[PDB]
Write a protein that binds this ligand. Structure first.
Ligand SMILES: C=CC(=O)N[C@H]1CC[C@H](c2ccc(F)c(C(=O)n3nc(Nc4ccc(S(N)(=O)=O)cc4)nc3N)c2F)CC1
Length: 273
């Protein structure tokens, strides 16, 4: 169950770009808050076309399932507005945006402990999802949102949240799945119905590679045909520039899904670094 938000209470201010068959906007929600105060809340609006009915159902099913969980590292959805010709997810606006963009804009001037802190937080979110037997299916650095920057005076680390899952790879066109190599694991390129909790362990490895590579995209030089051949020849990503997490990345990106470590074990490994 998603809280319903009246169309009249949503103002669209900025058109920010596109996700996978979504249009993204910054806006404001006029709402009655705690103690009955009228608030104008910055919101991020994910807009789906109603005509793409199967995409929409997958998208909002995923959003709702995960929003039934409350967790400090999972993005907050405020509700939905389906009172248009479009279905709108109304989400918290995370001030510092996507982690890959953030790393690029800061020219990768962040230390290894910052990266490990973010990795630990993402792993904590993924362990929570794993304990709930809930597959995310779209773990990547762009879906890691930075709530706050490190504060060296207070000793407070960066703090992240993981985005909603979006449309499932079980319904997306094959060409999209291939473009998402190497986040989409090899068994899912073989058959998108092989989606499993193990999927997210593989994608977590790819995401760690991104975090350690300053927001570079792995295999960016390879077109889809060559990405498919990269999996065919069972190749691994190059060791990232910060190589401290190279071993963990390879252990997560195991071509045998059953051999990928649990998030409890991933957290232990991160703790020991
Ligand atoms: C046209 C160029 C282009 O690629 N645009 C991209 C398109 C994909 C967008 C995206 C990706 C993944 C996400 F998880 C979110 C998301 O869920 N987000 N992002 C935010 N915060 C935020 C968003 C945008 C900016 S921005 N544009 O002003 O720099 C600053 C802060 N808050 C929440 N909840 C999201 F919006 C980001 C802009």
């Amino acid at each position: 169950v998603f809280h319903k938000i009246r169309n009249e209470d949503l103002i669209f201010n900025e058109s920010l770009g596109q996700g996978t068959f979504t249009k993204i906007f910054k806006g404001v929600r006029r709402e009655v808050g705690d103690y009955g105060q009228l608030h104008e809340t910055e919101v991020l609006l994910k807009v789906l076309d109603k005509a793409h009915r199967n995409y929409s159902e997958s998208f909002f099913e995923a959003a709702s399932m995960m929003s039934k969980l409350s967790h400090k590292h999972l993005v907050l959805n405020y509700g939905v507005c389906v009172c248009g010709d479009e279905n709108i997810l109304v989400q918290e606006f995370v001030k510092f945006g996507s982690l890959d963009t953030y790393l690029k804009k800061n020219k990768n001037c962040i230390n290894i402990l910052w990266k490990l802190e973010v990795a630990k937080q993402l792993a904590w979110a993924m362990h929570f999802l794993e304990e709930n037997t809930l597959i995310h299916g779209n773990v990547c650095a762009k879906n890691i949102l930075l709530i706050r920057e490190e504060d060296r005076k207070t000793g407070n680390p960066p703090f992240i949240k993981l985005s909603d899952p979006g449309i499932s790879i079980t319904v997306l066109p094959k060409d999209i799945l291939q473009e998402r190599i190497p986040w989409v694991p090899p068994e899912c390129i073989e058959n998108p119905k092989n989606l499993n909790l193990a999927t997210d362990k593989w994608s977590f490895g790819t995401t760690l590679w991104e975090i350690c590579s300053g927001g570079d995209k792995p295999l960016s030089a390879l077109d889809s045909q060559r990405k498919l051949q990269f999996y065919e020849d069972r190749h691994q990503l190059p060791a990232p520039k910060w190589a401290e997490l190279a071993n963990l990345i390879n252990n997560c990106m195991d071509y045998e899904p059953d051999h990928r470590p649990s998030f409890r074990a991933i957290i232990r490994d991160l703790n020991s670094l």
